[PDB]
């Protein structure tokens with residue numbers, strides 16, 4: 178329901194926008210560069226940058242400006258509070274104890290998978306590997322699960338923007354092979370990726386669905402290719418994922 | 430900074446956004462009002478502005494954050510120079526030791542690990558510190574506490590009870606004070622299972638050009654594998670060497 182302009186705090190709209198203008202390409206910003214990129218006057222943007230410094234979100238040498246780790250607290254506020262991650266935390270730690278592997282819940286954010294929940298159970302198998310909190314879609318188990326639950330339209334939309342570049346020697350780079358896998362995932366109800374995103378990383382995932390059948394999130398086990406064979410991952414870990422799926426149906 | 434340059438709407442809005450948590454996953458206007466110290470009318474506009482900008486959603490009564498909030502943290506992760514600068518040396522120390530290596534800095538009253546080595550270099554039974562840890566019972570925390578002036582230390586200890594987290598956590602202020610002055614004079618800190626059972630941590634300061642504390646460097650190991658004696662003899666030289674390599678901070 179459209180919000181009235183009397184209710185909009187402009188300093189907050191522009192402040193939050195400014196903070197997103199820091200990047201790998203723009204790690205620091207001067208007043209002139211920030212006025213450009215943001216569309217404000219130098220005099221105005223300087224007040225925003227100084228405000229960020231005073232609040233601890235930024236530092237300056239008096240001419241350049243860059244963000245501090247405090248920016249992480251924003252959005253950590255989202256990870257801590259978000260309903261689905263809080264609902265899925267206990268099952269993630271249970272499956273971590275049942276597998277001694279790294280367990281993750283993946284959701285779509287933009288064109289990537291984010292892992293809002295990663296197991297903190299500390300007894301993982303000797304040789305282990307943990308996925309980062311933000312991963313690409315086409316070469317990961319949770320990404321392919323998500324791609325497979327899109328219909329052809331958004332799929333082709335994603336694939337038009339993202340070209341299947343190889344991240345390891347083993348990455349699949351042919352669109353035809355990948356569509357075969359994507360339909361296999363929807364067929365069988367689970368996905369295994371063998372070292373297409375990261376060397377050593379074997380990942381098994383299952384979809385978690387809502388009552389209408391739509392994809393809400395994924396549940397994945399990451400293990401090291403030097404310990405388990407795919408055979409063993411299927412026989413030992415997949416039934417555990419199917420049990421977590423069933424347990425999670427009343428939570429929905 | 431003169432207060433004529435402070436945009437109060439940015440200040441209060443960012444302060445508001447941090448009120449959401451696991452204990453506080455949603456907020457109503459009066460809830461947000463009393464938690465933030467702002468009037469009912471002001472906080473209503475902050476929350477509707479967040480909704481309009483895509484950082485929040487509402488059902489006209491409760492408000493909660495969206496994933497767009499992550500882009501604010503992401504801007505730090507993409508752009509920060511220090512983690513990029515130290516990541517090579519951290520993954521080298523992890524290769525040299527087969528232990529979890531971390532770079533810590535103070536954020537608020539916690540240590541945030543700006544860099545943690547990949548879980549893959551680590552063999553054997555191990556235990557990795559979290560992304561954020563308290564100061565009074567960690568190696569990185571005690572290094573930071575030791576390099577503060579007394580008044581800043583007083584202010585930290587006025588805020589934070591020395592709560593037992595394990596059977597072995599130091600809870601006496603006087604003992605903790607004497608540990609802190611030993612760290613300053615020794616140039617390293619070892620903590621034996623005060624934060625987590627089984628976890629032993631050795632740390633050194635990373636100093637800046639002026640001699641001021643910039644970050645901490647720690648190696649975390651497991652008490653079932655190494656004695657404190659072996660940590661000191663085998664791993665401390667590795668950290669002193671990484672200190673020297675980092676002197677162009």
Ligand SMILES: O=C(O)CCc1ccccc1
Nearest residue numbers: 295296297557558559560
């Ligand atoms: O020890 C670990 O594996 C990491 C702890 C952690 C928790 C939540 C997000 C990132 C890392």
